[PDB]
Amino acid sequence: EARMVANCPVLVTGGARRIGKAIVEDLASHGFPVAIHCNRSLDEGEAIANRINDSGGNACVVQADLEGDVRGLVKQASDRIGPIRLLVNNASLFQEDKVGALDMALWDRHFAVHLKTPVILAEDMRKALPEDQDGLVVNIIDQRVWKLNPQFFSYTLSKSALWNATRTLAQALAPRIRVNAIAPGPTLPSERQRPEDFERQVSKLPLQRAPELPEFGRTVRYFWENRSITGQMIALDGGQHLAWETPDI
Amino acid sequence: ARMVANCPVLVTGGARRIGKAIVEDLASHGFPVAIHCNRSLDEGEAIANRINDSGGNACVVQADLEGDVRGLVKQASDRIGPIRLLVNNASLFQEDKVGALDMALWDRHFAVHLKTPVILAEDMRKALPEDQDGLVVNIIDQRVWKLNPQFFSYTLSKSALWNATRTLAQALAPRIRVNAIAPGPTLPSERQRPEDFERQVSKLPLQRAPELPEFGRTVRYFWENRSITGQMIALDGGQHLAWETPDIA
């Protein structure tokens, strides 16, 4: 009876750059109050918020280390824009490791950022969201959870766990809070990818095209706008998870 | 120019219930729409009349989808232009079970749910000019994500449509994308009084049925976000995620 965007405060983790920024600015331009979470990118976050507010939107910046104490984060956000109703678990760490050379410190960091904190923030959002309001969690995962391979060993396991948690969180938080996910494919070159590498990779996707940045915010809004959807994921990935031509064929 | 006026739609079984809801959403958004029907000709003509009298572009085409369908796409494209968006909505839903399988009904289930969607998709591909991308949306059933032994041949035929959603997406990439909607309980069934439908809905994880507007919104969501192929959204109130089975109650 009150799901208008002005009454749906959003918290986007790692929201000051790249895909997180694209989600923040999409939601803010559609009338959602947005809390831009960041850690290192505070300058960028404040600039985004100032631009939104000067344009007549409603945005704030909140700062927290997602590998430390995140127990005040939802409250820092709700103190500024009201009880968080839509949580986008976007923040990420994407470091390579391999079976045979596993460093468990890096392992722990992947699981902290991609699994522990998203679950904790979902819990905290649920606890603080008034009972007459429904909520939504959107987890940002990775297309590779739908096409497992042995590279990026601990990273992959932590993102796969976030996809597993999307189902079990959805079951646990139903009916009042829905939990869905986005699995990006090659969207913006990683730190290890030259432009040639990103382009060659995109040309090898089944759709031969990268997800465009507007598709991410549109998908969050799609999940918000269709209340029968929970426990589900859209891969914005150019078909990557459906790639199939292996050397044995 | 992917403007909706340049995206003719064919909806099979589009004169009633979910198919009608999809037709009317798309036409209200500026898509030219071909309403396929079989027994519901009067209903389909009334819909198309209302759309055309409103300044839209609609027509009605007839075919028994258990027989020859190889002229159906052309019936539509002769009226509204090359079909660019195919919604395989038509369905037959008749109970059978292991122990008393009648292969005549089995054949009808696979005709409507598998042979026809595949043939129409290929016919759409052959007639759609190479400089236009296309979309197929298959309407399946939440149960393909939570297999059970009821409605035996119906279920196998719908599961096959979900399988074909993936291999069609792989075959028709990059130019044509193939996605799916898996409905849950949307409207009461035969021998289901509204009280009965409500009691079943209350046992869904989200305790709410998909509403008809969600179907058109989902079709348009697939149309507008070009990185999605081979995927399905269950508009089902969480039904495929139900988990309280007798072994754990």
Next chain:
Amino acid sequence: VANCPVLVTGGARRIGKAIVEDLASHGFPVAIHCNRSLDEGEAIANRINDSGGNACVVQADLEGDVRGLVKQASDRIGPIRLLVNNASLFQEDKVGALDMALWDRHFAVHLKTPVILAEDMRKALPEDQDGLVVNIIDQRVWKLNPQFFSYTLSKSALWNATRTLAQALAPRIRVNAIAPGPTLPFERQVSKLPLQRAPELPEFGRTVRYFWENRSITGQMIALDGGQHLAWETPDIA
């Protein structure tokens, strides 16, 4: 084992033959179904019977009416308690060159016939005996690709039916499956499998007996495929 009569479809050559001869050496009565390989089936049955077993040959075109086949077998070796749906048709087609006659044949041999034979087995199974169906599918149903379009759809449906048959036929009959990889033509392909080795014929009979001997297993599949369904280095990864 002599209490467990077996029907193996397409049992006269290659993988079916290897399953037949394994089970026969372990004391299972076996009915060898075949169509074109009648002389080979009779030769296998003769060796089994000469060596003290109990084998027969039954004939049927599995693209047509198969409703007498289980009884043809049970008339000779007793009510069937182990059904191996091994027979297969493997012809190439693709979207955009679809021949529906071939499509119908793939679905007849891989889906309609396995289900009907399972249905007949269930109706004939004595009350005091449990049963097992083993469907022979294909590793590709665990790594979908668009090649061999109607063949793949029909094998995927057999895998779907393995689950729903298992649900429908419990507790009396368990329904499991084997997903073969490249067993017989090749040599270069195998080196590209993750295990760099092909499944060997003894593994198939060992797997059928494994399913028989462990009664808590239903609705499940083993891929004897050298890891083929786990292949992952696709063009976007290289």
Next chain:
Amino acid sequence: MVANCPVLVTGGARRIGKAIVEDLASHGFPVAIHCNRSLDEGEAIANRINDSGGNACVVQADLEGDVRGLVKQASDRIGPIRLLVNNASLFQEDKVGALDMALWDRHFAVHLKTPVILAEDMRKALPEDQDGLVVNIIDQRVWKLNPQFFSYTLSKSALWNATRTLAQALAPRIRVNAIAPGPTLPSERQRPEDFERQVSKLPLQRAPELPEFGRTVRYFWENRSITGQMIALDGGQHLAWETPDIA
């Protein structure tokens, strides 16, 4: 040959782990019985094995601490480990809304971190002219997800995910497969009468028998084309389907 395939079974002193150890040892495998608390049960099992002419030893280690000497302990006594059964488990309840990360961490340490580390150490110490096998003992619930036992389930689901990616990483020389038990023996919190009612509600209406577990490890060992896969010894539990929205 099984005489040339030394086995390490984590948590092998009781219940399912004991069933696996005794099945393998009685079939000619040298068996390193790992335990932590159940040292008396462990030494007893191995002594009965040895007295019977088998070849068993007991290695002790806390799987949540330094496990980097455990494979060495085993292989010092019975030769380089060729078959690792990651069976050790912790099964404690939590749920969304009251999650304590200390328990969460233990679930992931015993079900994911340690199985992966031990597999890593096995591959390091296995002579290159020998192939190997890892069998992860998981849980049928990874094939029928539900929101109960939240951190436990996530950690078991991770072990199932790792079964695929370890299989891809360690191929061709080492295979990685899994067993997903259903209701086998009542838990520290489940009454026998409740365990029986649960079994009566399984699709097959019977629990796995303890011999099925060792038979399954031996099945994986004897059939060299199998990797990255799991058998659920669960009486059909993961296939149960009649929920209140249908029933």
